Amino acid sequence: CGSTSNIKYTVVKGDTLTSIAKKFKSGICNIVSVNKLANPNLIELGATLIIPENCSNPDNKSCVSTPAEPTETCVPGLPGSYTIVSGDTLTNISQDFNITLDSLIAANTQIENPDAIDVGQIITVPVCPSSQCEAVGTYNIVAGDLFVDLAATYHTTIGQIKALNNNVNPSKLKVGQQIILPQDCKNVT
Amino acid sequence: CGSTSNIKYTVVKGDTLTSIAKKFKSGICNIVSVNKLANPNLIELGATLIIPENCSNPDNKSCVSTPAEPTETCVPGLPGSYTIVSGDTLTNISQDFNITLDSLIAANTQIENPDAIDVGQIITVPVCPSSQCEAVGTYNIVAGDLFVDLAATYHTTIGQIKALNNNVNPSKLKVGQQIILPQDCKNVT
Ligand SMILES: CC(=O)N[C@@H]1[C@@H](O)[C@H](O[C@@H]2O[C@H](CO)[C@@H](O[C@@H]3O[C@H](CO)[C@@H](O[C@@H]4O[C@H](CO)[C@@H](O)[C@H](O)[C@H]4NC(C)=O)[C@H](O)[C@H]3NC(C)=O)[C@H](O)[C@H]2NC(C)=O)[C@@H](CO)O[C@@H]1O
Ligand SMILES: CC(=O)N[C@@H]1[C@@H](O)[C@H](O[C@@H]2O[C@H](CO)[C@@H](O[C@@H]3O[C@H](CO)[C@@H](O[C@@H]4O[C@H](CO)[C@@H](O)[C@H](O)[C@H]4NC(C)=O)[C@H](O)[C@H]3NC(C)=O)[C@H](O)[C@H]2NC(C)=O)[C@@H](CO)O[C@@H]1O
Ligand SMILES: *[C@@H]1O[C@H](CO)[C@@H](O[C@@H]2O[C@H](CO)[C@@H](O)[C@H](O)[C@H]2NC(C)=O)[C@H](O)[C@H]1NC(C)=O
Ligand SMILES: *[C@@H]1O[C@H](CO)[C@@H](O[C@@H]2O[C@H](CO)[C@@H](O)[C@H](O)[C@H]2NC(C)=O)[C@H](O)[C@H]1NC(C)=O
Ligand SMILES: *[C@@H]1O[C@H](CO)[C@@H](O)[C@H](O)[C@H]1NC(C)=O
Ligand SMILES: *[C@@H]1O[C@H](CO)[C@@H](O)[C@H](O)[C@H]1NC(C)=O
């Protein structure tokens, strides 16, 4: 990293390795190496992390694959709607559903100011025509499970997991917890 | 029916044949016969119906099969949550999900008065462990489609269709409309 100092840092709410790397001008993957983190997406609330501060040589790329912006304008299979929870924005939610902000706004012309949405407000999620998820069912959380990783493994999206578990905070999952998990969501025909 | 008079009646919001039969002391199936209704569950907003009033011989049973109270304490497959819309009660919603009011209250100990719930409030739906719906996907409404009938045909529940389409009023469906439809929801193993 060719850093000049290290801070020992307590992980707080909202943190990702991306936001921590930015705060301290470190690299995501430098923090992964130094702390022998098994999964770059998983850092625990209240854990301590040694952070190389002010790196000349930040490695933010070798260990993660950060997706391009969403380009699709619909989500395969489900759901018809999503309910807004604390901290959601339409930008946030369209990214989770892997669609453009634009497509989510277009599906929701009842919203006038796209920046003023209310906890408890229901929005339309634009579902691709002729599409489906192959199985939707119970899953028990195991140690280190995250919505972000479960989406990739089961070929669904963060948003679709959130919609099926709309009152579950992804940051407060417990080993053994039952969530509802959609699988293999795709266009059909 | 051995009725004493007939009223010509305009179907309004909230009406079912059950509520109309009660208002006028008729029978569900007498109204079905007289008006040659193809489906006892389907009456259209603003349609006129001849109602035999004050029947001595009301037939409420021959043409419909009215389900017993729900006895199950969980819903197979999905969803983790449901958002409250105008006119919902926990009694209403537990019936749609084919579970006991009791089981729905027990899953929701954050609710203190079970009779004071708010438009936009999210509740937990108790999903049976080790359960699933086999496919969840798009369906286009055809003439005469109803959530009540679609549940039976596709082996799901009114509540599960509502949860996947939480901003759709079941009384305002249009031919060609795309909804999200779960199928073949059951316990597994
Ligand atoms: C490189 C990068 O920036 N990637 C991000 C990626 O991190 C974002 O995903 C979010 O990551 C955060 C941090 O990992 C997740 O929050 C954690 O969630 C887990 C699970 O709920 C929490 O784990 C629990 O921790 C406690 C102790 O705190 C243990 O007792 C529990 O057993 C444990 N549970 C399990 C099942 O292991 C953890 O505390 C949370 N940490 C924080 C700081 O909140 C978050 O869930 C995750 N978000 C999603 C939607 O999955 C991702 C956002 O999409 O973007 C980039 O990929
Ligand atoms: C015997 C008995 O009491 N059974 C009840 C059963 O009726 C309850 O189910 C509810 O029935 C009502 C009345 O049929 C349903 O409301 C109707 O919904 C349809 C579909 O949205 C509306 O049809 C539309 O009507 C307009 C004209 O008004 C047409 O232009 C449209 O093309 C047409 N759409 C389609 C697809 O055909 C109709 O207007 C509504 N009528 C009224 C009075 O609102 C209602 O959806 C239905 N509820 C559910 C959840 O399915 C049932 C409640 O669960 O309990 C008993 O089974
Ligand atoms: C978000 O959407 C895009 C486009 O639909 C996905 O990207 C493609 O996925 C398929 C596999 O199903 C591949 O054939 C393409 O090569 C993928 N890559 C690209 C650059 O389009 C993308 O995976 C989706 N992202 C997430 C996180 O779900
Ligand atoms: C509500 O729940 C009950 C019990 O789970 C269902 O009743 C049974 O369904 C199975 C078929 O899957 C039959 O083997 C039983 O004989 C059924 N009858 C009875 C009286 O239990 C019931 O069908 C569900 N109702 C709805 C409307 O979904
Ligand atoms: C799925 O089908 C829709 C409807 O045409 C289309 O817009 C969309 O891009 C398709 N998605 C994928 C991933 O192929
Ligand atoms: C499904 O399994 C659950 C979990 O044991 C049980 O309570 C429930 O009654 C079962 N439902 C049916 C329809 O068999």
UniProtKB/Swiss-Prot annotation, chains A, B:
Residue positions with a glycan: N54, N60, N92, N98, N187
Keywords: Chitin-binding, Disulfide bond, Glycoprotein, Repeat, Secreted, Signal, Virulence
Effect ascribed to mutating N41K: Results in improper protein folding but does not abolish chitin-binding
UniProt domain LysM: residue ranges: 7-51, 80-125, 137-181
Phenotypic consequence of L146R: Does not abolish chitin-binding and stiil suppresses chitin-triggered immunity of the tomato cells
Effect of T89R: Impairs the binding of chitohexaose
One MF term in the entry's GO annotations: chitin binding
Bridged cysteine pairs (disulfide): C1-C55, C29-C63, C74-C128, C133-C185
Main location class: secreted
Gene Ontology cellular component annotations, sorted alphabetically: extracellular region
Disruption phenotype: Leads to a significant reduction in virulence on tomato.
Description of what induces expression: Expression is up-regulated during plant infection.
Subcellular location: Secreted
Positions annotated to bind chitin: T16, T18, N41, I43, G144, L146, V148, P170, S171, L173
Annotated consequence of substituting T16R: Results in improper protein folding but does not abolish chitin-binding
Domain notes: The LysM (lysin motif) domains are small globular domains involved in binding chitin in eukaryotes. ECP6 contains 3 LysM domains. LysM1 and LysM3 domains cooperate to bring two chitin-binding regions together, composing a novel type of binding groove in which one chitin tetramer is nearly completely buried and engaged in many non-covalent interactions, including 12 hydrogen bonds. The LysM1-LysM3 interdomain groove binds chitin with ultrahigh affinity.
Remaining remarks: In plants, chitin acts as a microbe-associated molecular pattern (MAMP) that is recognized by lysin motif (LysM)-containing plant cell surface-localized pattern recognition receptors (PRRs) that activate a plethora of downstream immune responses.
Assigned protein family: Belongs to the secreted LysM effector family.
Oligomeric and partner information: Forms homodimers.
Record's function text: Secreted effector that enables the plant pathogenic fungus to manipulate host defenses for successful infection. Binds chitine, but not to any other glycan, including the N-linked glycan chitobiose. Outcompetes host immune receptor for chitin binding through intrachain LysM dimerization. During infection, sequesters chitin oligosaccharides that are released from the cell walls of invading hyphae to prevent elicitation of host immunity.
Name the record gives this protein: Secreted LysM effector ECP6
Originating species: Passalora fulva
Lineage: Eukaryota, Fungi, Dikarya, Ascomycota, Pezizomycotina
Record gene name: ECP6
